[PDB]
Amino acid sequence: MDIDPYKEFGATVELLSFLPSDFFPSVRDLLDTAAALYRDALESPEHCSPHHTALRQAILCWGDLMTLATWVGTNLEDPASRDLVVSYVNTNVGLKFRQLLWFHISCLTFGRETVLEYLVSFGVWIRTPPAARPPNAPILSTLPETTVVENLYFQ
Amino acid sequence: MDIDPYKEFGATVELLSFLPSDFFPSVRDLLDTAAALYRDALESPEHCSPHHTALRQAILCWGDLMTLATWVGTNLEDPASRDLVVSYVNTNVGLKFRQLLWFHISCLTFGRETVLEYLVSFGVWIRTPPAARPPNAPILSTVENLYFQ
Amino acid sequence: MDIDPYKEFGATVELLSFLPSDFFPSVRDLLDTAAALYRDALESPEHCSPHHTALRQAILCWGDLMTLATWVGTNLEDPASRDLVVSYVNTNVGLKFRQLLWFHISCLTFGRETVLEYLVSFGVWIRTPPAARPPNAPILSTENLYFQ
Amino acid sequence: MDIDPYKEFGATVELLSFLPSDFFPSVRDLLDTAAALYRDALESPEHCSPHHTALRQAILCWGDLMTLATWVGTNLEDPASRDLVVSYVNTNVGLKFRQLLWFHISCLTFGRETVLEYLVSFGVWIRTPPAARPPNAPILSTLVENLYFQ
Amino acid sequence: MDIDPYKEFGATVELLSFLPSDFFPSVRDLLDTAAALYRDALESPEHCSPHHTALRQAILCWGDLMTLATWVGTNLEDPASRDLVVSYVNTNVGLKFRQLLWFHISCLTFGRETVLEYLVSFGVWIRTPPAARPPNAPILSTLPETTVVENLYFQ
Amino acid sequence: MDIDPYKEFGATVELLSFLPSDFFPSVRDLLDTAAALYRDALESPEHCSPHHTALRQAILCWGDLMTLATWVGTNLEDPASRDLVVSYVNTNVGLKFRQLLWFHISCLTFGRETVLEYLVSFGVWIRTPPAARPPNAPILSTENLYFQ
Numbered sequence: 047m048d049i050d051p052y053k054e055f056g057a058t059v060e061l062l063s064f065l066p067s068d069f070f071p072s073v074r075d076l077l078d079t080a081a082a083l084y085r086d087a088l089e090s091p092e093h094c095s096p097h098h099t100a101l102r103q104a105i106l107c108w109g110d111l112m113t114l115a116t117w118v119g120t121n122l123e124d125p126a127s128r129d130l131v132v133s134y135v136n137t138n139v140g141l142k143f144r145q146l147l148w149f150h151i152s153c154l155t156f157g158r159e160t161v162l163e164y165l166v167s168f169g170v171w172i173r174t175p176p177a178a179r180p181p182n183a184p185i186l187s188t189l190p191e192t193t194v195v196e197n198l199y200f201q
Numbered sequence: 202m203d204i205d206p207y208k209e210f211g212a213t214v215e216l217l218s219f220l221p222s223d224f225f226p227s228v229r230d231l232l233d234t235a236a237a238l239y240r241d242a243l244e245s246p247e248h249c250s251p252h253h254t255a256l257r258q259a260i261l262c263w264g265d266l267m268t269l270a271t272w273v274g275t276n277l278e279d280p281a282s283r284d285l286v287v288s289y290v291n292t293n294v295g296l297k298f299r300q301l302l303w304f305h306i307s308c309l310t311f312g313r314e315t316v317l318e319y320l321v322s323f324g325v326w327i328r329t330p331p332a333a334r335p336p337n338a339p340i341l342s343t344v345e346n347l348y349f350q
Numbered sequence: 351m352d353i354d355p356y357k358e359f360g361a362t363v364e365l366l367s368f369l370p371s372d373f374f375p376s377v378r379d380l381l382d383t384a385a386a387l388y389r390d391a392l393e394s395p396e397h398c399s400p401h402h403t404a405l406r407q408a409i410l411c412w413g414d415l416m417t418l419a420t421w422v423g424t425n426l427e428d429p430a431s432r433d434l435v436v437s438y439v440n441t442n443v444g445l446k447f448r449q450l451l452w453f454h455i456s457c458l459t460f461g462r463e464t465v466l467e468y469l470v471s472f473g474v475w476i477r478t479p480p481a482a483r484p485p486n487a488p489i490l491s492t493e494n495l496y497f498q
Numbered sequence: 499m500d501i502d503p504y505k506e507f508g509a510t511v512e513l514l515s516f517l518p519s520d521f522f523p524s525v526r527d528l529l530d531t532a533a534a535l536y537r538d539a540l541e542s543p544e545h546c547s548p549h550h551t552a553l554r555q556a557i558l559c560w561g562d563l564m565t566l567a568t569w570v571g572t573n574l575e576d577p578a579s580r581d582l583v584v585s586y587v588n589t590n591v592g593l594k595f596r597q598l599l600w601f602h603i604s605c606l607t608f609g610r611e612t613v614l615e616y617l618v619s620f621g622v623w624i625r626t627p628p629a630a631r632p633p634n635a636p637i638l639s640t641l642v643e644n645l646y647f648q
Numbered sequence: 649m650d651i652d653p654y655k656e657f658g659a660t661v662e663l664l665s666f667l668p669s670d671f672f673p674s675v676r677d678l679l680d681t682a683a684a685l686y687r688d689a690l691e692s693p694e695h696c697s698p699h700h701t702a703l704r705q706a707i708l709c710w711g712d713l714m715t716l717a718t719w720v721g722t723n724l725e726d727p728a729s730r731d732l733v734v735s736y737v738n739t740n741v742g743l744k745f746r747q748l749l750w751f752h753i754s755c756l757t758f759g760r761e762t763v764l765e766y767l768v769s770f771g772v773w774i775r776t777p778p779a780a781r782p783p784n785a786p787i788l789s790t791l792p793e794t795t796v797v798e799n800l801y802f803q
Numbered sequence: 804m805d806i807d808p809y810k811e812f813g814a815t816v817e818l819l820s821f822l823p824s825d826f827f828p829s830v831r832d833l834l835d836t837a838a839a840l841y842r843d844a845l846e847s848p849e850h851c852s853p854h855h856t857a858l859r860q861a862i863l864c865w866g867d868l869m870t871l872a873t874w875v876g877t878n879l880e881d882p883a884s885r886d887l888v889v890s891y892v893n894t895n896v897g898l899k900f901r902q903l904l905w906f907h908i909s910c911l912t913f914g915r916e917t918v919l920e921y922l923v924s925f926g927v928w929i930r931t932p933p934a935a936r937p938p939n940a941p942i943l944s945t946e947n948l949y950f951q
């Protein structure tokens with residue numbers, strides 16, 4: 047099968063690939079943030095949303111990879127090679143999970159449309175030559191809960 | 202965090218662990234069954250169901266685990282050592298994914314209630330001594346006169 | 351005192367003894383089934399039933415027995431006598447607890463009469479010569495309030 | 499599973515463990531008291547109460563531990579005092595059963611509320627320094643129409 | 649800063665000092681009593697009372713002190729010097745926490761006034777020569793606010 | 804007992820531990836700020852607030868800890884282990900008290916909801932890669948005669 051984990055969420059692997067690897071927080075920091083903001087939802091008996099369901103699996107999958115990588119490492123006769131398999135996972139699959147965790151955590155806070163627009167905004171900014179672009183990166187931020195039109199309507 | 206992947210689906214890790222490892226099809230056979238029955242839905246831009254969403258991730262996660270386990274296996278000296286990794290996968294994370302893939306595929310066909318009832322039925326049958334129990338395993342499956350007047 | 355643990359549940363040690371030891375699931379499998387089916391009730395602050403009360407104590411007692419048996423195994427100077435302890439447990443107190451756990455778990459699922467009738471049914475079948483009896487064993491198949 | 503045998507009776511292992519081991523009668527004396535006061539009920543075909551059901555199992559469980567201990571001493575000991583196994587049992591699991599038998603026998607006589615209050619009363623008394631506390635321990639105890647005189 | 653932990657509770661360090669060290673249960677026995685009587689309240693999300701808030705911190709502080717003393721003790725190889733750490737705890741900070749835990753646990757059960765009156769009663773009794781005083785110590789108990797006659801009068 | 808000192812104040816240890824250790828002022832700087840802003844309230848015979856009650860105990864507890872550490876340090880044989888005591892304080896109990904003192908002092912100034920929101924804001928900012936985030940950290944922030 048050819049399954050793109052972003053496709054049911056309105057995105058693609060190629061679109062997440064538009065961002066440089068340096069854009070994404072680390073796996074540990076994504077996992078810490080998922081816990082700080084969404085632990086209760088993620089641990090609840092309710093689906094909550096497709097993003098929650100996917101994020102739960104992504105978190106556990108990283109755990110599966112690290113548990114396997116740690117176990118083999120303990121079996122490597124060279125004690126200096128203890129985290130060699132763990133390093134292998136980070137090198138070849140770490141970026142994939144950073145993209146995926148970032149996507150779901152961000153979508154849960156900002157909504158798909160805002161996240162996808164930000165992906166484009168940053169990817170265009172980082173491809174503009176540094177001496178020709180605004181010094182600071184674009185900012186990821188939430189939409190207003192109420193529009194100016196609605197606010198003025200109820201004056 | 203402590204996330205139980207079955208909890209949002211009305212089950213638990215402990216409940217799936219009630220079944221012996223020999224109960225489950227192999228991961229390869231589970232993956233081939235998911236493809237034969239649900240490939241178009243799994244590859245679609247539609248969520249379809251929480252089971253589809255979870256199953257998509259599990260399928261992809263197993264691919265990651267196999268690339269890792271294959272990399273360790275193909276780069277490991279000694280047949281006994283590679284036997285150990287294959288054994289470790291068989292005993293631990295392979296069993297986890299056999300449970301998980303079986304659960305989601307079965308739920309997509311029979312519904313949660315039927316699946317959970319079958320888990321108990323088989324788990325009780327296999328714990329009954331063979332000489333005392335029915336020879337075959339339990340099976341997973343799904344008008345008045347007035348009516349004619 | 352002479353207490354029969356089955357007496358308040360309508361049975362006796364003698365009746366459970368009518369079944370061959372091979373009839374019963376293992377202690378481990380009985381404990382796993384009690385957890386799979388009744389963990390929440392067994393761990394709850396509610397009595398639930400006399401079967402739950404008895405089953406709670408039986409589960410804890412087996413833990414006590416295993417801790418004692420482990421201490422005997424580790425403290426016996428001779429390795430051959432450790433073997434005797436295990437075989438003694440399997441033959442004697444392990445069988446007692448297989449009977450007891452099976453009885454209460456089955457009663458919680460099927461009710462007292464069905465269980466008592468099944469004990470007799472299987473005990474009669476296994477005593478019928480194999481070449482003269484049905485090829486398969488009889489089947490165990492089908493509450494909230496408890497009088498005295 | 500994590501089963502607390504006191505939980506269905508409104509108590510916990512931790513609560514019983516608030517009492518020092520010296521608080522409790524010996525297992526033998528608890529068993530003699532169960533027999534003297536409740537033998538007929540314990541041996542009857544009636545449930546009687548959840549306390550009776552639990553007490554029956556606890557009495558039989560101690561029998562199982564002692565039968566095991568005695569059998570090892572008889573068969574697997576020669577010049578050993580053959581009381582080595584029996585001695586370990588009374589050292590570790592004996593306290594657990596003194597708590598359990600005492601709880602059920604006391605509840606059958608005084609009721610849960612009075613028993614739990616007494617556990618707290620004695621636990622506080624024994625933790626008060628002896629030279630600062632009352633000399634005697636707290637005590638476990640529990641407690642006509644007008645027309646007649648007109 | 650010079651803070652007296654009793655001042656917001658109507659007492660002082662000097663007043664608790666009026667009681668001899670032998671008056672107090674050990675820290676362990678005070679902690680075990682706090683758990684037996686107040687565990688649910690102490691672990692709850694509600695303030696409950698200023699005594700509860702203070703008692704919560706005292707329990708945790710003792711944990712901090714013993715964890716530090718343990719780490720020092722277990723990482724000191726000479727056994728005599730480990731006994732020096734224990735003696736320092738017993739001599740100095742153990743008495744401070746025995747006073748403090750006793751005060752808060754007693755106040756939660758009997759109220760401030762009864763506790764302070766009892767502090768005085770015992771401190772006076774123990775300073776009376778043993779051959780001249782009642783054989784038994786005064787008793788900590790809640791006194792009745794009204795007499796039987798008064799209670800019957802307002803029936 | 805398992806007491807979370809933040810629980811009665813609407814937070815948890817895990818939430819405070821979302822912030823990196825470098826976020827917090829030193830214990831000394833927290834204590835000096837508490838004295839500059841709240842000394843009279845803290846030394847008063849009035850409860851003032853649950854935050855004041857908790858903060859009083861934390862201040863005294865730090866005094867207990869440092870005298871113990873000083874007594875150990877001044878009686879230790881070799882400076883390398885004197886350095887070990889300081890390092891233990893810096894890594895373990897100093898971090899706990901930096902979190903705790905900061906929480907109470909900040910709550911007394913800004914209120915719980917502002918503090919908890921700021922914790923999240925900074926914790927997310929510091930986890931954003933430096934080259935991708937705003938250059939500055941988020942900020943913690945909140946006649947008489949004519950009407951006679």
Ligand SMILES: CCOC(=O)C1=C(CN2CCN3C(=O)N(CC(C)(C)C(=O)O)C[C@@H]3C2)NC(c2nccs2)=N[C@H]1c1cccc(F)c1C
Nearest residue numbers: 069071075076079148151152155186927928930931935936
């Ligand atoms: C937790 C939700 O995610 C965010 O809020 C995320 C953010 C939100 N932004 C964080 C940095 N920023 C501030 O501090 N701001 C300050 C203020 C005052 C609020 C404002 O000016 O508006 C704005 C800006 C907002 N940025 C990003 C990324 N930016 C670039 C590359 S990555 N990723 C995630 C994220 C981050 C860390 C861990 C995670 F796990 C995740 C998912």
Ligand SMILES: CCOC(=O)C1=C(CN2CCN3C(=O)N(CC(C)(C)C(=O)O)C[C@@H]3C2)NC(c2nccs2)=N[C@H]1c1cccc(F)c1C
Nearest residue numbers: 224225226230231234235238302303306307310340341342
């Ligand atoms: C595809 C949905 O799953 C099933 O249908 C599943 C089945 C369905 N059963 C298959 C075997 N059976 C028949 O052929 N039957 C024939 C008939 C005519 C209908 C009848 O006699 O009633 C009944 C019985 C039904 N059994 C199981 C398991 N049984 C025991 C241990 S495992 N697991 C899954 C499953 C299986 C393979 C790959 C998968 F990937 C999965 C998930």
Ligand SMILES: CCOC(=O)C1=C(CN2CCN3C(=O)N(CC(C)(C)C(=O)O)C[C@@H]3C2)NC(c2nccs2)=N[C@H]1c1cccc(F)c1C
Nearest residue numbers: 325326328329333334373375380383452455456459490491
């Ligand atoms: C969990 C309740 O117990 C049972 O259900 C028990 C059973 C239930 N039976 C299990 C075997 N069977 C099937 O799979 N059946 C299939 C079907 C379709 C439902 C039907 O034909 O009706 C019937 C038959 C029913 N049998 C027994 C024993 N039989 C003989 C000796 S022992 N003991 C217990 C038990 C078992 C294991 C662990 C335990 F822990 C216990 C207690």
Ligand SMILES: CCOC(=O)C1=C(CN2CCN3C(=O)N(CC(C)(C)C(=O)O)C[C@@H]3C2)NC(c2nccs2)=N[C@H]1c1cccc(F)c1C
Nearest residue numbers: 521522523527528529531532535600603604607637638639
């Ligand atoms: C049999 C019910 O239990 C009791 O009555 C129990 C008692 C009852 N008390 C017995 C001692 N007492 C008297 O003699 N009293 C005499 C009188 C005239 C009424 C008075 O002076 O007031 C009061 C006082 C009541 N005390 C206790 C415990 N106290 C402290 C630690 S243990 N445990 C159990 C118990 C005891 C033994 C074997 C058991 F098996 C048990 C269970």
Ligand SMILES: CCOC(=O)C1=C(CN2CCN3C(=O)N(CC(C)(C)C(=O)O)C[C@@H]3C2)NC(c2nccs2)=N[C@H]1c1cccc(F)c1C
Nearest residue numbers: 622623625626630631632635636671678681753754757788
């Ligand atoms: C738990 C509340 O504290 C008490 O109840 C406290 C008590 C209560 N007293 C306990 C001793 N007593 C009884 O048993 N009494 C009842 C009795 C036997 C029926 C009778 O009247 O003769 C009265 C008398 C009341 N005494 C004390 C202290 N007394 C002297 C020095 S210290 N300190 C605390 C306390 C105690 C232990 C652990 C703690 F942790 C604490 C705090």
Ligand SMILES: CCOC(=O)C1=C(CN2CCN3C(=O)N(CC(C)(C)C(=O)O)C[C@@H]3C2)NC(c2nccs2)=N[C@H]1c1cccc(F)c1C
Nearest residue numbers: 826827828832833834836837840905908909912942943944
């Ligand atoms: C004393 C109350 O606490 C504060 O005010 C606290 C602050 C207040 N902030 C101080 C730094 N800032 C300014 O100078 N600002 C300038 C101005 C003009 C007023 C504005 O733009 O608003 C804003 C910003 C506000 N920041 C913090 C922390 N920020 C980041 C990590 S820690 N912690 C505490 C605190 C600090 C020191 C000792 C303590 F002890 C404590 C508790």
Ligand SMILES: [Cl-]
Nearest residue numbers: 227229230233
């Ligand atoms: Cl095949």
Ligand SMILES: [Cl-]
Nearest residue numbers: 535536537538
């Ligand atoms: Cl009698």
Ligand SMILES: [Cl-]
Nearest residue numbers: 685686687688
């Ligand atoms: Cl409580």
Ligand SMILES: [Cl-]
Nearest residue numbers: 630631784785
């Ligand atoms: Cl006295």
Ligand SMILES: [Cl-]
Nearest residue numbers: 840841842843
């Ligand atoms: Cl001031």
